[PDB]
């Protein structure tokens, strides 16, 4: 099932070359789930994201 998420704040850019940024998202169906994800490209607050699988929380150092 496809799931949409709205970001809340941008934590910082990760990756070896800084090709990703790590952002905290919040859902649309129920504003209780808040998972952490990695995204590439320009991201700002209020962006709506399409998550293919909303099960695992992304992680990098």
């Amino acid at each position: 099932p496809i799931k949409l998420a709205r970001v809340t704040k941008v934590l910082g850019r990760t990756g070896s070359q800084g090709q990703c940024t790590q952002v905290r998202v919040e859902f649309m169906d129920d504003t209780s789930r808040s998972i952490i994800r990695n995204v590439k490209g320009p991201v700002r607050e209020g962006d709506v994201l399409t998550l293919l699988e909303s099960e695992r929380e992304a992680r990098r150092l």
Binding site: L11, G12, R13, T14, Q22, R60, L61
Partner: peptide, 25 residues
């Protein structure tokens, strides 16, 4: 602190870096 040390090792540092790049009359 242990929890401060773990959370610092789990999240990413960000913030300070200043990149310097780049009429009336």
């Amino acid at each position: 602190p242990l929890a401060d040390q773990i959370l610092a090792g789990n999240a990413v540092r960000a913030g300070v870096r200043e990149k310097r790049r780049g009429e009336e009359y």
